Design a protein around this ligand. Structure first.
Ligand code: HEM
Ligand code: HEM
Ligand SMILES: Cc1cc(N)nc(C[C@@H]2CNC[C@H]2NCCNCCc2cccc(F)c2)c1
Ligand SMILES: Cc1cc(N)nc(C[C@@H]2CNC[C@H]2NCCNCCc2cccc(F)c2)c1
Ligand SMILES: C[C@H](O)[C@H](O)[C@H]1CNc2nc(N)[nH]c(=O)c2N1
Ligand SMILES: C[C@H](O)[C@H](O)[C@H]1CNc2nc(N)[nH]c(=O)c2N1
Ligand SMILES: [Zn+2]
Lengths: 407, 411
């Protein structure tokens, strides 16, 4: 029932009790581990509301108080009559913060308690949504001194009146198929880009064209809006030693801001809830630039360094990969935009992990995602056993709106 | 019921049915994934199901399932179990068993090679001296003057659990570690305790950074005995870098033959508790883990110093820079001496090919992502992007506790 996790580098052993308060299903069974898989009513809502309010009132040291019981009856009275309910502001801030605290795939959670929450539940139209989003972006960006934030639109009602940001991130580069055969810009965003064009976007058709927002309010057909270019902080990519690096013409945006996830608090579902923090360096240098399925620039860079690409055993990909990632961290720092390197991020997460074990009895963590996509074993997280389980409140994936929403 | 795995780089989708033939548990539940946890006497009753299961497998593969000779072998194993409470594998079943344990080893990236295993049968062995000789011959055959060949040597099975054959070494060739009174270690820090054991069994320690440990060998549940591997048999490679000439002055070498000697081979219910096996190295095993782990030789600083990197902020990626150079050096040194080695790009790529082939012909390939993805440069290898299903097939290799923790000393 109780479980041990061992760090194999420090021999430190921790005991997890938090997993018994775990609720949703993992995908795994006694017969099969699915750890590496990316995606494995009134009667339903009240248990969910109760479990959430119980943890809320317990966190404020008021479990079994008058204010507790009374709130429990009030939600019950709202559920029985309205078939949903409304979170108080204080409950909403707690819910969002804990959804982040519980995100087993996030290395950045040491910061969980500093989330700035923007309550956009009074929003009704896409122009309304656009305004809230620009305020989010500007607030979070802070001229390069980035701050964590989430903006929460109105919750699901009947599932015919959903608020959705169709973009997967608020700031992303477009993807275009060429008559040539290959791809200009980000090949990850090719489909969405075509949905932007088919909705009426004028695409400049270059390598780094910031996509327009596609916003859906109250189940309506979604609407295009360009983000004020003055709000999109971007960094030109140079290397501190290699002069030729700048003429690759690389740039990235400072603000990572996930906008396609669904926030669940006390059985209530918030389908538009964009959140943003700041980058770990490898997210851009390793994944965005070097993934065969992304900008895939390793070939071009290795060529500029004059490495031996005759054989894989010269480790030329690995050499180029390090430099690319050195260039990313350097560029961001030189422009004073917050960024964390993978050594720093993982060390902080080990500190966070040990904080959560002593202060909560555990910390759900997905090793496959926490271990950075380069230099895994030289980061302390590699040697750290982790337990993965699903707690609520949480962020969940949701189907893309275009596969679903009717026109 | 059929399960799909997706490669997120290529969008290739594969369908697994083999997991239906899975028996043992994984450690996971619907409520918890233990996918990153390192370690999560039998009765007649259970033994015949296991035998039957295995012989059904064996006879299926040779296309003799249900034949007179398959039936006769069931009846004969049946009888042997009730008459003696155990049974004996035929030669052909042993081979086959051993190849399939490797094949089913979900943490091993080297399985494309599974069908080429040299099996040595050492089931006539009765003494520690007998074991030394079998192991020497193993090492010589597998080494093949640098042109490494996979091999397994199999000693007699467990009977009552009181008469076990064990190789107390975790690997047949490994370097000593010696903790000093000042708190530092000389040599491989992983081996400190096994070293102490060898010392107190009578090994007179040379006490250098690279002393090849003696073999400590238990036969027939007896106390084990010391033996030096003949040095002419221990192929070693001095480590140098193709461009950095100060690299050899670091004084590093490594042995060429990785040979795991602490695992338990389970086939058709029988337990072979000494089955050392050996292959060749993937370069990252030496350059990333053996040299650069903080708990191992820990040379990153010393190398980054000599490279004059900016070491005053981790954000210079000095560790990542030094790590790549050391790994370049390891592959360079092995190749120049014509000792078999494989780089991680080449090994992960071959494994992906192995894996797809296994889905087509076998209906699955159990694989453990945490272990298969290399400890550097993860996402630039094709495995990082491969979803994988992990489950337990038999025959298999299993962990077993360290013999010094369980052994009843006789004197
Ligand atoms: C503050 C700095 C932050 C850092 C350094 C960070 C880091 C990361 C990283 C590296 C990943 C894996 C990303 C990938 O490779 O695609 C991740 C995933 C995730 N992060 Fe954090 N994050 C931060 C802020 C936040 C915030 C503010 C939230 C929510 C409030 C959050 C919630 C999540 C969630 C839900 C995932 C999983 C997404 C998925 O499953 O695809 N993060 N994070
Ligand atoms: C021939 C070349 C081979 C290569 C390149 C190879 C590669 C590897 C690597 C890199 C690992 C885990 C890395 C680590 O040590 O942490 C591993 C694990 C393993 N290998 Fe292979 N291997 C090879 C041959 C074999 C052979 C001959 C066998 C047995 C017949 C075998 C069975 C296993 C087993 C059972 C594990 C799991 C070990 C554990 O769970 O700790 N391998 N292999
Ligand atoms: C808030 C925040 C801060 C930060 N530093 N980092 C993040 C990572 C985002 C989250 N989620 C994707 C990451 N961004 C990477 C963009 N690629 C898509 C990821 C993906 C791939 C395959 C399947 C799938 F469903 C999603 C968020
Ligand atoms: C035959 C062969 C060839 C090859 N290239 N490679 C191998 C890897 C061996 C097998 N298995 C690990 C490697 N041997 C190293 C010892 N393992 C330390 C990590 C560890 C820590 C704690 C518990 C545990 F189970 C393992 C074998
Ligand atoms: C905690 C974690 O599972 C452990 O450190 C594992 C991770 N992956 C590994 N993978 C390999 N190949 N070898 C190892 O020793 C480990 N260590
Ligand atoms: C197949 C595998 O699950 C997949 O490629 C995962 C592995 N780990 C990851 N880890 C992070 N942080 N981000 C990712 O997108 C992925 N992709
Ligand atoms: Zn699992």
């Amino acid at each position: 029932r109780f479980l041990k996790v061992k760090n194999w580098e420090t021999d430190v052993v921790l005991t997890d009790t938090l997993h018994l308060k775990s609720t949703l299903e993992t995908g795994c069974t006694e017969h099969i581990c699915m750890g590496s898989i990316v995606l494995p009513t009134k009667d339903q809502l009240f248990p969910l509301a109760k479990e959430f309010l119980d943890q809320y009132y317990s966190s404020i040291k008021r479990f079994g108080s008058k204010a507790h019981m009374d709130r429990l009856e009030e939600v019950n009275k709202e559920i029985e009559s309205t078939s949903t309910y409304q979170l108080k502001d204080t409950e909403l801030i707690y819910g969002a913060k804990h959804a982040w605290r519980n995100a087993s795939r996030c290395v950045g959670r040491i910061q969980w308690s500093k989330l700035q929450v923007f309550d956009a539940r009074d929003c009704t139209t896409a122009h309304g949504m656009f305004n809230y989003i620009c305020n989010h972006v500007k607030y979070a960006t802070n001229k390069g001194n980035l701050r964590s934030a989430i903006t929460i639109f109105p919750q699901r009602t009947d599932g015919k009146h959903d608020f959705r940001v169709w973009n997967s991130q608020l700031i992303r580069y477009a993807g275009y198929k060429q008559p040539d055969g290959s791809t200009l810009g980000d090949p990850a965003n090719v489909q969405f880009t075509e949905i932007c064009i088919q909705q009426g976007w004028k695409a400049p058709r270059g390598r780094f064209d910031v996509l327009p927002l596609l916003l859906q309010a109250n189940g309506n057909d979604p609407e295009l809006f360009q983000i004020p270019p003055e709000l999109v902080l971007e960094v030109p990519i140079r290397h501190p030693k290699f002069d030729w690096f700048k003429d690759l013409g690389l740039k990235w945006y400072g603000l990572p801001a996930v906008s396609n996830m669904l926030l669940e608090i006390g059985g209530l579902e918030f389908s538009a809830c964009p959140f943003s923090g700041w980058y770990m360096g490898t997210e851009i240098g390793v994944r965005n630039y070097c993934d065969n399925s992304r900008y895939n620039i390793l070939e071009e860079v290795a060529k500029k360094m004059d490495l031996d690409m005759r054989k894989t055993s010269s480790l030329w990909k690995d050499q180029a990969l390090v430099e690319i990632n050195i260039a990313v961290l350097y560029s961001f720092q030189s422009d004073k935009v917050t960024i964390v390197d993978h050594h720093s991020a993982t060390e902080s997460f080990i500190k966070h992990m040990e904080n959560e074990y002593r202060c909560r009895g555990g910390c759900p963590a997905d090793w496959v995602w926490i271990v950075p996509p380069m230099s895994g074993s030289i980061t302390p997280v590699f040697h750290q056993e982790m337990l993965n389980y699903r707690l609520t409140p949480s962020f969940e994936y949701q189907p893309d709106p275009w596969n679903t929403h009717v026109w």
